[PDB]
Design a protein around this ligand. Structure first.
Ligand code: HEM
Ligand code: HEM
Ligand SMILES: [Cl-]
Ligand SMILES: [Cl-]
Ligand code: NA
Ligand code: NA
Lengths: 713, 713
């Protein structure tokens, strides 16, 4: 079937905005996973998981009699797709069980691990999501083997279709760098938003960079990819050495014996893949990565033997049975157990990337400290494991169940508890009135609240207006946020806040986070009044103010909007057209195409644009809430041409006279060009639409204001 | 950006089942277009449309001062994509305004026509859909030019994204036959379900078949394509000669002057395309098809001049200014007006396909009759125009407004009015009890009601259980319907109906159509009781019984299921895998993926399979309504292998013993293979799911039973 994507491969793709519809969801409209989980007997699940670790199935027999290593690998890969640059990937949606992740080469034989979990999934049904179960299983594996974890939170609801993620442009699995779709340029600079060195890997190549087995150069790739997954040097060392305390790799024979990945396998495979023709195809004969390394003398028990071996031996380069580069301690005795034959023992082996921990100078210092102080190693690993597996779960308010750690961690962007009565409706009306009486304009109000609320991204549920981090470094100095205008608004709102709070009885006070939002609501209400319409914008108090000391400035950098079509803002020049970056931002904001369309056209006429640019301001009543953007954008009396100065700026002129009416960017004019977006613009630009426009604008404005309010979930 | 389709181009595509979600729809959940239209002042709209016809806009100046030709073409293109094989295409969704139809080469410059209608669309907003407006505008054009139409019905709700239709496999627009993706094979046999001779055409090539200007061989293509669009010879001659009474073609210069189609055009084109560098690029200089023909002496007025010219001259082959083959009248005077210069006149011209109407023997007889009896021509053209533009609208119950023709037409598959009191709840309970007492089995009951209801297709809203057409030719004889078993069920139900009806007072009676569905409900109820569950299946009376004379047997043939996965039925061998045909049927039934999943797994255990096949009957309690299909399908204790005899049949054996447990087809096993369908199967196969399965099964069963119930809409 030839499709639209075939005829018009560069048209904008809206389908990413209508994924996750109620149509694809098997659960009822009212199903609430947190309610279900909260009644799960979690202790019972963990007991069944503990029994499972040592109950070998003949179709994928357990190494050493214990599946714990396999399950730790499964849970680390579930979490290990995460990229800080956009928040996408991670364990939070259980996406390892969908394409393409289920079939990535680095996820080979994790289809077996997931299948081992079906009996338990089936037993507990909807009360434990696959997403939660993958992580819980890795915790239970660690615990069964003697390792004390830092805790566990439930609350990852299942999803029902693949997410749309840019994983790279390569068309070949595992393509080495330098090809026609290379993700590298310059001096080994990996393109944003990617966080892996090759298509279909989690982070790095275990043999070394593009297969070159140099521990020192491998360490460069480790550091860069782990940083792109939000982990620093100490977390990276602790995670790699911790994970490789357990289990083993699989490379018993040549990789050519391994068949089709799950998405390519025959229907009789029933969702499994990588069927191998090497001997029995499993167990002693397993082939997964092609490497054949067992790190420690007790692969089913927590120990400090990884570092004992790494530092205690001198290493030499060798080849696995599948021909991959790996390292062996030739002076060692045969002290490592065989996974299936109690009469065999093996010498210590390591991957190139394990030796990175010793031969990179900065990693060596850390590894040495963990070697000498294994209690420090255990604590670091427990903390990093928790971070790894929860990094995309959002605010602590989403965390469910009896094992949530009480310690509040800086990475969580924590929000202080609220310990005082909240403003009520009358108080909100009084504050709206004071804000409007202060002289702050509709534009200032709308822009400030937008700036605060629109850092949210649903990919990892970071950002949003809770915390009032807009007043802190680095958000207060972001170019998009108009730092000097922003400072003047915040000073005025802070004086209003101080006056109101000082006049109260009995502990009632308003947060600046809440007042910034409410003030935005007042601006929207005044804009509707300017247009002749009385509306009330809904407002939910309860946000709290975070301190600068509770705010990791470097972690906050990835939230900076460098492209924000809702404010007609582009920080620099990008390869990707601005309209594509608008849809990407809409997706992060969890907006449908209709919601994107209404929100943009209202923001334009409210004066939300950065720098007060006239681009897309297609109204002669700026700061009134009307459908003017749509009516003027769709007026065929106006003809549009790119300017000589800038091909991405357009002049709209009267078709009969030539007089200049408007200017616009690609983001403005896409609404008049794309056949689906123009059909939406039409609805809002019709003569019957004034009420609908205002209603829908208020609804989406309020949705954006509440994106991080999991305390009301 | 590499996607799943790139890695796994053959994996089954479910996205077609989640199109048209509430996410992509700008209107509220509760918007009811029928109610909006019913309040529209249709007469006011028609007045504005009449004024438009001669209000020429300088960006696309009106030929002869009158847009009527352009608009008739527009409306006939809107309706002209329709295929009887699947009911897809047609005017009923307003898909002309979306990709790919907006950019088909045969729809060149209809972007201009649609833009001329924006001011009227805008004025009346949601109360007139684009879909309705395109057809209305064609009617008004006819009326403005002196032709009285047969009528008009509103009610075509707008859609908000492209439909997924198979339009062919060619990768080149207008590719001639015999290429790598040829839609032809054999003795010019066009592949089902296609109804056009080339990719991007409505029906045929106006120069002739593959560009060869032979009117006789063009006639063969016209007859075949028009038959695939539900039109016979008389309707075809009436439509072509009727349409070509008006207007003109556009080919003033070489086609290389025309640039990008709308989906490929720059953003500044604002939704238009085909911009031409030939002289002014419009009006007297327009280029659309490349042909330059004006048919009649009065192109803006209804006349009998088409047939006067066709028969009154001999025709000579010639070339347009763009190089296309066309015909000119030998020896004629310059009697045809120029569209823009009152001092110029031109000789009569014709397309190859117009000369088909004279040189094909069967068409010549009809054309001669219309030539001698122009009142017969006018009435046939009115009737065919109405059919053309309403053929995909469904039952008469959907038709809205004050211009709906009262005459009931055979093509509408008409249902007689109900003129008597309906059965009530007590009576329904009495009939269900009589059905269960008769000895009919759960399997017979469920199979019969499935067979009757599952002929519905949402593409053209034909089919369904209303009418009791299952008892008439040809449905009673369809292989899928198990004609001999069907006849024994219908005999028993007809005896029950006669006895019930005979015992009533006061005119109350039950139709056989209702009893077939009620009886299916009884079977589902009994199945639930067999499983130990108390269930009540909803039932809405009011279907009536159609007669054989109200049932066009040839038109009914395209509704025959040759593949019905829900009955594990495949009539023969097809190129397309059975699972792909299952998703196609689910799409015609308007089902989501979850609904398709639950319905199939219930049907399997209820005994709905054709021929009582054991394929997919994964239960030891056949005719009990349980989730057994899912629990047994997902049992990893069972291993699946294709049989030696047939690669599309599989054996499921106990993995440890080798004993045979089950057999299944691809339709059955795709639910344990495809990663999205497997995730749905898992929900229904969990230990907490028996009640959800029953409740979701009853809901989808009832949905299918009511698909054609537009009298309750
Ligand atoms: C530089 C980072 C990493 C590299 C290149 C890497 C590479 C690999 C490879 C190639 C295997 C063998 C796959 C097989 O053949 O079965 C694997 C196994 C494993 N990895 Fe990693 N790893 C990395 C980091 C991690 C981390 C962060 C963890 C967990 C905290 C993890 C835990 C494990 C475990 C437990 C296994 C054993 C699997 C089994 O027993 O079946 N690794 N690693
Ligand atoms: C064999 C079937 C048909 C063929 C091959 C065909 C071919 C064409 C072509 C090539 C044009 C010229 C496009 C352009 O250059 O502007 C056209 C114009 C037109 N056709 Fe057809 N036609 C067919 C049937 C129909 C039917 C069924 C109708 C309506 C009932 C129709 C009504 C018109 C009208 C009104 C125009 C004039 C457009 C204008 O004035 O701008 N034709 N036809
Ligand atoms: Cl994701
Ligand atoms: Cl369609
Ligand atoms: Na994420
Ligand atoms: Na259709």
């Amino acid at each position: 079937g030839t499709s639209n994507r075939d005829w018009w491969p560069n048209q904008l793709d809206l389908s990413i905005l209508h994924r996750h519809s109620s149509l694809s969801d098997p659960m009822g409209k009212d199903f609430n996973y947190a309610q279900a989980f909260e009644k799960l007997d979690l202790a019972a699940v963990k007991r069944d998981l503990h029994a499972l670790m040592t109950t070998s199935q003949d179709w994928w027999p357990a190494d050493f009699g214990h599946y714990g290593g396999l399950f730790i690998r499964m849970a680390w890969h579930s979490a290990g797709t995460y990229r800080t640059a956009d928040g996408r990937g991670g364990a939070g949606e259980g996406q390892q069980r969908f394409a393409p992740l289920n079939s990535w080469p680095d996820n080979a034989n994790l289809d077996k691990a997931r299948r081992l979990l079906w009996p338990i999934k089936q037993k507990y049904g909807r009360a434990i999501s696959w997403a939660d179960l993958l992580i819980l299983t890795g915790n239970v594996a660690l615990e069964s083997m003697g390792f004390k974890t830092f805790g566990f939170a439930g609350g990852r609801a299942d999803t029902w279709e693949p997410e749309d993620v840019y994983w790279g442009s390569e068309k070949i699995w595992l393509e080495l760098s330098g090809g026609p779709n290379s993700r590298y340029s310059g001096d080994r600079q990996l393109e944003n938003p990617l966080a892996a060195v090759e298509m279909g890997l989690i982070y790095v190549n275990p043999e070394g960079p593009d297969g070159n087995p140099d521990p020192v150069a491998a360490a460069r790739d480790i550091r860069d990819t782990f940083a792109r997954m939000a982990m620093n040097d100490e977390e990276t060392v602790a995670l790699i050495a911790g994970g490789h305390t357990f289990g083993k790799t699989h490379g018993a024979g040549p990789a050519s014996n391994v068949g089709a990945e799950p998405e390519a396998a025959g229907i009789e495979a029933q969702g499994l893949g990588w069927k191998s023709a090497y001997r029995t195809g499993k167990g002693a004969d397993a082939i997964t990565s092609g490497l054949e390394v067992t790190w420690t003398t007790t692969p089913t028990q927590w120990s400090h033997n990884f570092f004992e071996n790494l530092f205690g031996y001198e290493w030499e380069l060798t080849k696995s049975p599948a021909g991959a580069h790996q390292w062996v301690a030739k002076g060692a005795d045969a002290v490592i157990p065989d996974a299936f034959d109690p009469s065999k023992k093996h010498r210590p082996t390591m991957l190139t990337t394990d030796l990175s921990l010793r031969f990179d100078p900065a990693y060596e210092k850390i590894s040495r400290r963990f070697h000498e102080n294994p209690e420090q190693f255990a604590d670091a690993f427990a903390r990093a494991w928790f971070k790894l597996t929860h990094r995309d779960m959002g605010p602590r308010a989403r965390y469910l169940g009896p094992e949530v750690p009480a310690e509040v961690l800086l990475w969580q962007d924590p929000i202080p508890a609220v310990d005082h009565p909240l403003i009520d409706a009358a108080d909100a009306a009084e504050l709206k009135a004071k804000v409007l009486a202060s002289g702050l304009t509709v534009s200032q109000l709308v822009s400030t609240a937008w700036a605060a609320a629109s850092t949210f991204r649903g990919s990892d549920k970071r950002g949003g207006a809770n915390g009032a981090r807009i007043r802190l470094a680095p958000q207060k100095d972001w170019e998009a946020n108009q730092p000097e205008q922003l400072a003047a608004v915040l000073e005025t709102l802070e004086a209003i806040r101080t006056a109101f709070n000082g006049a109260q009885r009995g502990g009632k006070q308003v947060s600046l986070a809440d007042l910034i939002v409410l003030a935005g609501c007042a601006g929207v209400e005044q804009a509707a009044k300017n247009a002749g319409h009385a509306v009330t914008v809904p407002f939910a108090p309860g946000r709290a103010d975070a301190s600068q000391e509770q705010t990791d400035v470097e972690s906050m950098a990835v939230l900076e909007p460098v492209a924000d079509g809702f404010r007609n803002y582009l920080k620099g020049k990008y390869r990707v057209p601005a309209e594509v970056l608008l849809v990407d931002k809409a997706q992060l904001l969890t907006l449908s195409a209709p919601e994107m369309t209404v929100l943009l056209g209202g923001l334009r006429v409210l004066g939300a644009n950065v720098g007060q640019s006239r681009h897309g301001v297609f109204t002669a009543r700026e700061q009134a809430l009307t459908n003017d953007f749509f009516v003027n954008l769709l007026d065929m009396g106006t003809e549009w041409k790119p300017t000589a100065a800038d091909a991405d700026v357009f002049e709209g002129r009267d078709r009969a006279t030539g007089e200049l009416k408007w200017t616009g960017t690609r983001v403005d004019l896409v609404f008049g060009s794309h056949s689906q977006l123009r059909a939406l613009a039409e609805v809002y630009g019709s003569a019957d639409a004034q009420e609908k426009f205002v209603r829908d604008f208020v609804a989406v404005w309020n949705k954006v204001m509440n994106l991080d309010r999991f305390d009301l979930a």
